[PDB]
Amino acid sequence: GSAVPFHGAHQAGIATPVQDRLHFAAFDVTTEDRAAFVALLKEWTAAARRLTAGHAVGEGAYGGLPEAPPDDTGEALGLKPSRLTLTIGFGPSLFTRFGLADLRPEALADLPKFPGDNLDRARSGGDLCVQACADDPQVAVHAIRNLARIGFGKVVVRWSQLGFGKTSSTTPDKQTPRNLLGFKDGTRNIAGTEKDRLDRFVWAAEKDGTPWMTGGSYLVARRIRMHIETWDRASLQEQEDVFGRDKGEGAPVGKAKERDEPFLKAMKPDAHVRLAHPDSNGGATLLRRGYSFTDGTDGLGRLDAGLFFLAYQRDIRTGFVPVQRNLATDALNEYIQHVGSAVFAVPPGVRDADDWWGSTLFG
Amino acid sequence: GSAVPFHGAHQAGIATPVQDRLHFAAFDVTTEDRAAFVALLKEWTAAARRLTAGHAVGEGAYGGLPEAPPDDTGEALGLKPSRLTLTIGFGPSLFTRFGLADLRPEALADLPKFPGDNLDRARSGGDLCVQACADDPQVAVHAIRNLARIGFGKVVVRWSQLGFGKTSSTTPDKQTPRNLLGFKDGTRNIAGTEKDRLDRFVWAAEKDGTPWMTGGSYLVARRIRMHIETWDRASLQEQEDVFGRDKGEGAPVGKAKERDEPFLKAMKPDAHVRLAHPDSNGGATLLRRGYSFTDGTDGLGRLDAGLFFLAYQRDIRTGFVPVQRNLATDALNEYIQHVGSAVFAVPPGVRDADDWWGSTLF
Numbered sequence: 151g152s153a154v155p156f157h158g159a160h161q162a163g164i165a166t167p168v169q170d171r172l173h174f175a176a177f178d179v180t181t182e183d184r185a186a187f188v189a190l191l192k193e194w195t196a197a198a199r200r201l202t203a204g205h206a207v208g209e210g211a212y213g214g215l216p217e218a219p220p221d222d223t224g225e226a227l228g229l230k231p232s233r234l235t236l237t238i239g240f241g242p243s244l245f246t247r248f249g250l251a252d253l254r255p256e257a258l259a260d261l262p263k264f265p266g267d268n269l270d271r272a273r274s275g276g277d278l279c280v281q282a283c284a285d286d287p288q289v290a291v292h293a294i295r296n297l298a299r300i301g302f303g304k305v306v307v308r309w310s311q312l313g314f315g316k317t318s319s320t321t322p323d324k325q326t327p328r329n330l331l332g333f334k335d336g337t338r339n340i341a342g343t344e345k346d347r348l349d350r351f352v353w354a355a356e357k358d359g360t361p362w363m364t365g366g367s368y369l370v371a372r373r374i375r376m377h378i379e380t381w382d383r384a385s386l387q388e389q390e391d392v393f394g395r396d397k398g399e400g401a402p403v404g405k406a407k408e409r410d411e412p413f414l415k416a417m418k419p420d421a422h423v424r425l426a427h428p429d430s431n432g433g434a435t436l437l438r439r440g441y442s443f444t445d446g447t448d449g450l451g452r453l454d455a456g457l458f459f460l461a462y463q464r465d466i467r468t469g470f471v472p473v474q475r476n477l478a479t480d481a482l483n484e485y486i487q488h489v490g491s492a493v494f495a496v497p498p499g500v501r502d503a504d505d506w507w508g509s510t511l512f513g
Numbered sequence: 514g515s516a517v518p519f520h521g522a523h524q525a526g527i528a529t530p531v532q533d534r535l536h537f538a539a540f541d542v543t544t545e546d547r548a549a550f551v552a553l554l555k556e557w558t559a560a561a562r563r564l565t566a567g568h569a570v571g572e573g574a575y576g577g578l579p580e581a582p583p584d585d586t587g588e589a590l591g592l593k594p595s596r597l598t599l600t601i602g603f604g605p606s607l608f609t610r611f612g613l614a615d616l617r618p619e620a621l622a623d624l625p626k627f628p629g630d631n632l633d634r635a636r637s638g639g640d641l642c643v644q645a646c647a648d649d650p651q652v653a654v655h656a657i658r659n660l661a662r663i664g665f666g667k668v669v670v671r672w673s674q675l676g677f678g679k680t681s682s683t684t685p686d687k688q689t690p691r692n693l694l695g696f697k698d699g700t701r702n703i704a705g706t707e708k709d710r711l712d713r714f715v716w717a718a719e720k721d722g723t724p725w726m727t728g729g730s731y732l733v734a735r736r737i738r739m740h741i742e743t744w745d746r747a748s749l750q751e752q753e754d755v756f757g758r759d760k761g762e763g764a765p766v767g768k769a770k771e772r773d774e775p776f777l778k779a780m781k782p783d784a785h786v787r788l789a790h791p792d793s794n795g796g797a798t799l800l801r802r803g804y805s806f807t808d809g810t811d812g813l814g815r816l817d818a819g820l821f822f823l824a825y826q827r828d829i830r831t832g833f834v835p836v837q838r839n840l841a842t843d844a845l846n847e848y849i850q851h852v853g854s855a856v857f858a859v860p861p862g863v864r865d866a867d868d869w870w871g872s873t874l875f
């Protein structure tokens with residue numbers, strides 16, 4: 151299909167079909183004035199309604215007064231909506247502003263330091279995020295560029311990441327995508343069709359303790375670099391032993407098919423799948439919605455490439471934290487490094503044409 | 514999703530329809546052994562035949578000996594060829610090695626300094642380049658990665674540039690793409706069907722004075738930063754005056770349709786199209802084939818944005834040089850800065866399955 155509806159009980163871009171491309175941006179707030187910030191949220195919501203339907207923002211990209219700047223910067227003219235979704239989230243640091251300190255959710259927990267972390271503070275944190283997903287990267291970039299422009303004077307862009315998954319024009323919808331290590335990635339995940347599993351593991355409930363967040367979720371972002379040239383010198387057996395699945399079919403060891411359920415005892419004790427599996431973590435289960443990246447080459451000639459990992463969950467303390475803690479001895483650690491991090495509370499959806507992003511928090 | 518044929522009188526990736534994604538790499542050579550370098554060119558050619566057909570390199574991505582590394586890194590398994598083209602070029606610095614000094618073509622000229630240039634030396638130059646273009650970014654990264662792996666110990670990556678979306682056209686029958694300033698870019702180019710114009714302006718000929726380059730071309734690459742804060746506060750009229758075309762349709766000033774011919778005297782004297790047009794430059798004409806980029810933020814609260822400009826021509830001295838010199842007074846200069854530069858000789862095509870990249874030189 152061509153467009154994804156913007157309105158709902160939940161924000162789109164979480165349980166809705168995974169699009170081919172990502173532009174993720176974190177913003178910092180520069181105003182102290184609550185009223186001015188609320189005004190921005192309303193203007194952003196109006197723009198998002200236009201963008202997700204394939205229309206220009208405000209009065210358009212051309213045809214207005216010649217002596218005024220155009221309302222829309224124009225680089226998406228002639229393109230389709232491209233299944234664009236725009237998903238907003240609020241960082242812990244937002245809650246030190248506007249008198250919000252007592253409304254920070256307990257489920258919006260600060261992450262501990264994990265072994266091997268090497269976080270760049272410039273590419274970590276942020277007061278706000280917008281996740282822009284679409285099948286055409288120019289559609290996603292146009293959205294971020296215009297939201298940043300509307301917000302100028304009240305917010306700045308802290309850090310930005312481009313990503314890619316599959317190319318849907320050429321690649322069947324049911325084929326699992328491969329990551330840049332060459333392994334199928336996504337086999338055992340929560341799918342958007344699994345209503346009950348979403349209620350149990352992804353959406354915040356009223357009884358969880360923070361009423362304004364009912365129908366929202368909690369997001370963890372990790373920029374994870376791969377040591378590509380080291381990995382490529384490893385033997386085939388070493389690579390398969392790191393994961394506990396074979397590289398060609400992606401079946402669990404001792405099984406024949408990708409979707410065969412794993413027998414954890416046949417994998418090495420520090421294999422990634424064995425450590426990450428819910429049965430190893432008291433039942434803890436995540437929705438993964440991440441994207442590959444390749445940014446260029448670094449000063450030594452090496453490929454700057456990896457996984458921009460995104461996980462959604464009902465509570466950070468019972469989702470990402472236990473699972474990542476259990477990866478302390480993962481065989482994969484030799485070939486990766488976490489170099490950026492942030493956490494966000496993703497509010498409930500925009501109910502109808504008169505609602506706006508953050509209305510349950512701000513009133 | 515289809516394959517583009519690899520063999521021909523010319524390399525693919527020039528007159529070919531422009532693909533959605535770019536991965537460009539420049540390499541420096543680290544061996545002094547001519548025979549070892551020739552062996553690398555042959556192994557690279559064999560890999561390129563596989564990659565452009567959607568097959569894995571060497572003996573494949575899996576099912577070999579458990580105790581050896583796979584020949585192919587595996588991340589393009591199950592993907593279509595996706596119009597992958599691989600185009601190789603040789604930089605001026607290459608000709609200081611392997612006894613090649615007297616074979617350097619005259620048409621491979623060093624560029625002069627241009628006013629406004631702020632060139633980063635680390636993201637400029639290179640002994641050789643590979644341009645990988647495809648509709649799928651994973652297919653393009655896979656090709657560059659596997660070529661670099663095969664070359665370990667003989668070549669190193671100097672610098673690379675990814676392009677997320679095209680800003681050029683060799684197919685006038687299809688929609689012209691927009692750059693990040695919001696204007697159509699590629700209306701008046703050279704089309705892949707225009708055989709006469711390609712022979713006059715793009716392909717090198719025997720009589721030009723370097724026999725080994727017959728059927729090849731010359732490439733200029735310029736990395737250009739865009740001052741999008743400054744641009745986004747300009748009025749609509751200011752933006753249109755800079756180019757000489759309207760923003761919505763992309764028609765020449767005063768006309769109704771994109772593809773109507775420009776009437777240059779109705780444009781401002783410093784308009785980009787007026788200064789760049791062949792009629793303003795003694796007939797000099799280019800094949801433009803560039804892509805947009807964004808590499809994160811600038812550290813000052815804004816998105817970074819630019820255009821990786823690529824031009825092909827029969828002689829650098831009669832193509833890019835005169836046109837860029839004429840852009841000294843361009844109104845666009847207020848909004849852009851050139852921050853990287855490289856030139857390359859692009860050899861002729863790989864004729865058949867016994868031929869190899871660079872065979873006419875070596």
Ligand code: HEM
Pocket residue numbers: 329331333334335336337338339372374376393395412422423426427428436456457459470473474486
């Ligand atoms: C570059 C980093 C990573 C790579 C390359 C990677 C790769 C993979 C692969 C190939 C699988 C098996 C196929 C599948 O079920 O998806 C897998 C499964 C999984 N990964 Fe990772 N992963 C990475 C990081 C992480 C992180 C940071 C977490 C959580 C903190 C995580 C959690 C999981 C989970 C929960 C599973 C599914 C296990 C199961 O239920 O069978 N992964 N990963």
Ligand code: HEM
Pocket residue numbers: 692694696697698699700701702737739756758775785786789790791799820822833836837840849
């Ligand atoms: C960021 C840099 C640039 C931008 C945004 C830009 C934009 C444009 C636009 C919008 C057009 C009109 C549509 C078309 O015919 O393609 C154009 C035309 C053209 N540009 Fe540029 N351009 C840039 C840099 C350059 C450079 C560096 C050169 C060559 C040195 C160049 C050469 C041309 C030529 C030859 C034309 C066609 C003129 C004609 O025959 O009508 N441009 N450019």
